[PDB]
Amino acid sequence: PVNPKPFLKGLVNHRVGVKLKFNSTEYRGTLVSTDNYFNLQLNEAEEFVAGVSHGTLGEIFIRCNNVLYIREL
Amino acid sequence: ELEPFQKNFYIESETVSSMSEMEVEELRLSLDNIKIKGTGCPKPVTKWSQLGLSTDTMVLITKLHFGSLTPIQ
Amino acid sequence: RARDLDLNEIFTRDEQYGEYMELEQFHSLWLNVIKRGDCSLLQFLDILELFLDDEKYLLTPPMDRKNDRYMAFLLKLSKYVETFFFKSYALLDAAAVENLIKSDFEHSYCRGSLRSEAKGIYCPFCSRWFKTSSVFESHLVGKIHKKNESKRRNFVYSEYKLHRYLKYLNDEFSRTRSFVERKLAFTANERMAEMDILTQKYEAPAYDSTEKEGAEQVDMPYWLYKLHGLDREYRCE
Amino acid sequence: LANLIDYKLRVLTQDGRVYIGQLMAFDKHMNLVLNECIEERVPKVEKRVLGLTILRGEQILSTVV
Amino acid sequence: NGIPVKLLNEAQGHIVSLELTTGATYRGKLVESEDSMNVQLRDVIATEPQGAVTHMDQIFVRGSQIKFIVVPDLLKNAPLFK
Amino acid sequence: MKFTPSIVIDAPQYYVDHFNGKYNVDKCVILRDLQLETDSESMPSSLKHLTKPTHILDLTNNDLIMIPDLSRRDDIHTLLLGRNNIVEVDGRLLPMNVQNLTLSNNSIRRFEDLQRLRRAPRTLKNLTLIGNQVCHLANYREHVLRLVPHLETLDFQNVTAEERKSAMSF
Amino acid sequence: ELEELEEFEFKHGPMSLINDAMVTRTPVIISLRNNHKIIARVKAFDRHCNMVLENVKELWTEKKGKNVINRERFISKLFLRGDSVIVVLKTP
Amino acid sequence: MKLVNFLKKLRNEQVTIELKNGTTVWGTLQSVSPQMNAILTDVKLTLPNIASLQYINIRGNTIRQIILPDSL
Amino acid sequence: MVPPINCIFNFLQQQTPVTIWLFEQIGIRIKGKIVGFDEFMNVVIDEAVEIPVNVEKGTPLGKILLKGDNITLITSA
Amino acid sequence: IAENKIYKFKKVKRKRKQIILQQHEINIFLRDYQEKQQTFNKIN
Amino acid sequence: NTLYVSQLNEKINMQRLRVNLFLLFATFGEVLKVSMNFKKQRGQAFITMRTIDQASLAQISLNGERFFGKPLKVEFSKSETKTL
Amino acid sequence: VSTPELKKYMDKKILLNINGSRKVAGILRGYDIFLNVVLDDAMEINGEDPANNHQLGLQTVIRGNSIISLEALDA
RNA sequence: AUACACAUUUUUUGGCAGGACGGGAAGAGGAGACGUCGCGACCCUCGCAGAGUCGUUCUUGACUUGGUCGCUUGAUGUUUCUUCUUCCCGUUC
């Protein structure tokens, strides 16, 4: 079975973007690491609010709980 | 397998840490010509309050020791 | 006569009945009036020190003295310092002090009390200097100074009070700053025990059941005794 | 919390409603059983007599004597 | 287990009133109460926050969804006074 | 003798029947926030140590002359004044939300003495004067209704629009 | 052994941002659920992202009867719950 | 380690707790439970006009943040 | 009369297009094929699309890991 | 001042809370006094 | 300690009846009863009193008192109240 | 972990009300410790008035954490 | 005298977004549902007991299971739509 954890491990070291439940914020950056509780670390992050670039944040941590989904870009 | 422990309890006060090296040399000469040997010696203090001791201790000391800190102190 | 008199309803625990004055709160508010966090408790106290000087708080202001947030803050703080002052020295005639300060304010402060050999005479209300006393006087009737003295009067006066009351409390200011540095240089256990002490001092009877009334002052053969046979106590029946 | 037992207590709910009643027992989740408990909403206005109630610790905000 | 859970298990067979996180009120005879507060209820009269009232035969609501219950005063005697 | 805080601290303090809360007043005498009964209260005073937690005040069986000297008490809803000698009422009473007043068996003589009860805004719903000389005077009921229409139940009788209108007619 | 693996996973995981923050005493900015933000230095952290923060400057956004204004205040010693954290950003 | 223990150290400390609901609390910590349930005395409380309360217990999960003295 | 995990497993094998109803969100729902899942009901969903109901449009997202907490109701289309 | 004496006898040092207390008590006392002095001036 | 009253205007709601009864009978002593158990009104209220002398005094002094239009009839209860 | 005593409800048509003011009707198939439910012949009752047969025989799954309450249509 | 309390039902979250004031009345250009608890009564109804039974002992353990009409201008939330003047009574300066 291909589990979310192996898919995500393969997604590490790749450009991703993560849409939070709020959808008020999306984050596009390289996926540095993710833990067993699925908190997210991204680098070079860029914030897309309402589909527009808000700014370039850089090395960023995302609380697992806020994550709606993650997609590869 | 020895138990690790803390030995550094010193927080250099801002007023002391602001002192330049020339200032520190001068302070040592003025304090009965204090001479040091060894690497990394912290700067001398000139007041009991630059040592971060509780008020109890402060009251107690003064009480315990009357007048200015000695050069050795 | 005063059986329901309670100091704890006048002094907070951090003030220790006049030992210290609690300025952390004002660091929160005052510090925020700057819209940043570059300001530490100690740097804030460093700011307050300006008001011990007769000219610094006027010519080297933390913020622009025409800023709203700033003037409001200064008001609140001033009020605090004054109430603290009279709170910690009940025995002195409050009205006397008040009137003294007010008269000093009217007769000197607003009359070109601040003078420089170079720039001349400074005005608290317009924040400008003046060549000679002549132009200074004919400026105190101008529409500008009328406007300002008519709008920023309360603030100027409050600033002044903060000044003189902080001067009268120099010993308490220093005492507290010291306290700050101490607590700051504590560890966890230390800070905790100290807090315990302040607390106990706060919630303790003003008179202990264990106080004094009328205690006025004026103005070898070590091995030999074992050898002797006292290793085993002997007895005659 | 054990000291508060049997007292009349005021709990504030998650929805802003205020409940008042005797605290008979608690548990780990902070589920409370309140005897002769009544509800006040706005401050008396909109007061109702509920009687014996359990409240869930997930909903409870705070309690006061 | 929780002492209030023990009471709520004593409440079985009685008529109770339930308010859920939505605010609807279900009054009726409690069949069964699990440890997780999941409750099975009979002959329920329901009053909505709008004021509308309905009748339903059997209802079972999740524990987590319940704001609070009111149980009869008969139980108040004992043995929770200890 | 006097109602003083030392007395305020330690009377039988508990919750009314009605679950109305309070904390009572008896070091040796007269009480407050519960059972102010039978300790010869001359003048009400020192209500401040009550410090607000009281729904009810059972003043009955004291020697109270008038009802003034009430600090601002938001919580007090019910006053049980029975078996005193209340001749007059203060006027600036205005303890907001005083819903119930029990003047039973006192010595209020005149209609005009009742006037101060009108000040009770819309909270004084229940008032009982029965046992006073003023009750005997003519058109007592109608004058109380026209004076304090806030009352919903007078002398444990309910107002009713009929005698409201008669009170308007006179 | 179990403790070791936990600390290690913490070290090479996403937490590495807050670990790095405490060791370098670097400022980080925290987007919270209150729509307030906290820029501060990390004194201590926890698995729940409970934190002790020093030199706190919180920025926020308020609406009035005219243009939106940002408001900010300084809190020197601030302890923070771990569920309020939406995001912790580490930046130069 | 566990910061909740760090809160357990905080008895007899005067603090201002902001809560997730926005409520401001000011008072002296009598104790905090490991749940971070905080019991305080001499509390002035501002709901989002201050109510003064002898004792207040708060459920830990509701606590947004607690502001400690800078002297700590 | 089958446990939901086995239901999801037959979605996995059949590779049917799946529509998820999210939590507290009527406006948008997500759709795509289930290539895998875990015990926390986090699902890798391929050729996923966001479907705002408010005729319906949507955004193609490609491969997605959707967290199980959002999941309200998993279906087939 | 130091020896805490007024003439010959050096008195026991008191703690701050008590000193302040008594100072506020003396404060209210002086208030009473000022009041009485006033009414007296208005009666004499 | 408990007095049984009857012959009262049942048209009064339960809570107002109880508050007026507690009010009226507080003049003789503390009333311990919080609420009418009988939940049937029609006068049949029981009033529980902490001391017995207050019960006797209330009985003798308030016989046939006009209360909500009707002269109340007061007697001693047949049994002791559960709270006593 | 406790298992909900839902056996009495098995193979009965039920009206589930779910968060977001959603309501579905269907025959109770399976359940688990988690209160997650399989519903056959599921029908969504939209807020308007119409209803859509989402899972006539294909069956749906509802997360127990989203299940507000469940009404038995049958006895 | 001798470990744990962040992965579905609870606590590590789906949350966020002379002047002014009140009241009461009148005169001119706030009202309609749908509920839930009250002032009166031409009415209903008519009485001492959480209730009802038993074993053993001077007091306990088991087993079963206000309602209606008005308001003659009572109080309260969902939910749609669109103030002035005069007189009286309270607070403040």
Swiss-Prot record, chain A:
Keywords: Cytoplasm, mRNA processing, mRNA splicing, Nucleus, Ribonucleoprotein, RNA-binding, Spliceosome. GO terms for biological process: 7-methylguanosine cap hypermethylation; mRNA 5'-splice site recognition; mRNA splicing, via spliceosome; spliceosomal complex assembly; spliceosomal snRNP assembly; U2-type prespliceosome assembly. GO terms for molecular function: poly(U) RNA binding; RNA binding; splicing factor binding. It is found in: Nucleus; Cytoplasm. Component of the Sm core complex, present in spliceosomal snRNP U1, U2, U4/U6 and U5. The core complex contains SMB1, SMD1, SMD2, SMD3, SME1, SMX3 and SMX2 (Sm proteins B, D1, D2, D3, E, F and G, respectively), and is probably a heptameric ring structure. SMX3 specifically interacts with SME1. Plays a role in pre-mRNA splicing as a core component of the spliceosomal U1, U2, U4 and U5 small nuclear ribonucleoproteins (snRNPs), the building blocks of the spliceosome. Belongs to the snRNP Sm proteins family. SmF/LSm6 subfamily. Present with 2570 molecules/cell in log phase SD medium. This is Small nuclear ribonucleoprotein F. The gene is SMX3. The chain holds residues 12 to 84 of 86 of the full protein.
UniProtKB/Swiss-Prot annotation, chain D:
This is Small nuclear ribonucleoprotein-associated protein B. Component of the Sm core complex, present in spliceosomal snRNP U1, U2, U4/U6 and U5. The core complex contains SMB1, SMD1, SMD2, SMD3, SME1, SMX3 and SMX2 (Sm proteins B, D1, D2, D3, E, F and G, respectively), and is probably a heptameric ring structure. SMB1 specifically interacts with SMD3. It is found in: Nucleus; Cytoplasm. Residues 1-65 form the Sm domain. It comes from Saccharomyces cerevisiae (strain ATCC 204508 / S288c). Belongs to the snRNP SmB/SmN family. C-terminal extension may function as a nuclear localization signal (NLS). It comes from the Eukaryota. Present with 861 molecules/cell in log phase SD medium. Plays a role in pre-mRNA splicing as a core component of the spliceosomal U1, U2, U4 and U5 small nuclear ribonucleoproteins (snRNPs), the building blocks of the spliceosome.
Swiss-Prot record, chain E:
One of its GO terms (cellular component) is Prp19 complex. Belongs to the snRNP core protein family. Plays a role in pre-mRNA splicing as a core component of the spliceosomal U1, U2, U4 and U5 small nuclear ribonucleoproteins (snRNPs), the building blocks of the spliceosome. Also binds telomerase RNA and is required for its accumulation. Component of the Sm core complex, present in spliceosomal snRNP U1, U2, U4/U6 and U5. The core complex contains SMB1, SMD1, SMD2, SMD3, SME1, SMX3 and SMX2 (Sm proteins B, D1, D2, D3, E, F and G, respectively), and is probably a heptameric ring structure. SMD3 specifically interacts with SMB1. GO terms for biological process: 7-methylguanosine cap hypermethylation; mRNA 5'-splice site recognition; mRNA splicing, via spliceosome; spliceosomal complex assembly; spliceosomal snRNP assembly; U2-type prespliceosome assembly. One of its GO terms (molecular function) is mRNA binding. This is Small nuclear ribonucleoprotein Sm D3. It comes from Saccharomyces cerevisiae (strain ATCC 204508 / S288c) (Baker's yeast). Its main location: cytoplasm. Residues 3-75 form the Sm domain. Keywords: Cytoplasm, mRNA processing, mRNA splicing, Nucleus, Ribonucleoprotein, RNA-binding. The lineage of its organism: Eukaryota, Fungi, Dikarya, Ascomycota, Saccharomycotina. It is found in: Cytoplasm, Cytosol; Nucleus.
Swiss-Prot record, chain J:
It is found in: Nucleus. It comes from the Eukaryota. Present with 3920 molecules/cell in log phase SD medium. Belongs to the SF3A3 family. mRNA splicing factors, PRP9, PRP11, and PRP21, are necessary for binding of the U2 snRNP to the pre-mRNA in an early step of spliceosome assembly. Belongs to the CWC complex (or CEF1-associated complex), a spliceosome sub-complex reminiscent of a late-stage spliceosome composed of the U2, U5 and U6 snRNAs and at least BUD13, BUD31, BRR2, CDC40, CEF1, CLF1, CUS1, CWC2, CWC15, CWC21, CWC22, CWC23, CWC24, CWC25, CWC27, ECM2, HSH155, IST3, ISY1, LEA1, MSL1, NTC20, PRP8, PRP9, PRP11, PRP19, PRP21, PRP22, PRP45, PRP46, SLU7, SMB1, SMD1, SMD2, SMD3, SMX2, SMX3, SNT309, SNU114, SPP2, SYF1, SYF2, RSE1 and YJU2. This is Pre-mRNA-splicing factor PRP9. It comes from Saccharomyces cerevisiae (strain ATCC 204508 / S288c) (Baker's yeast).
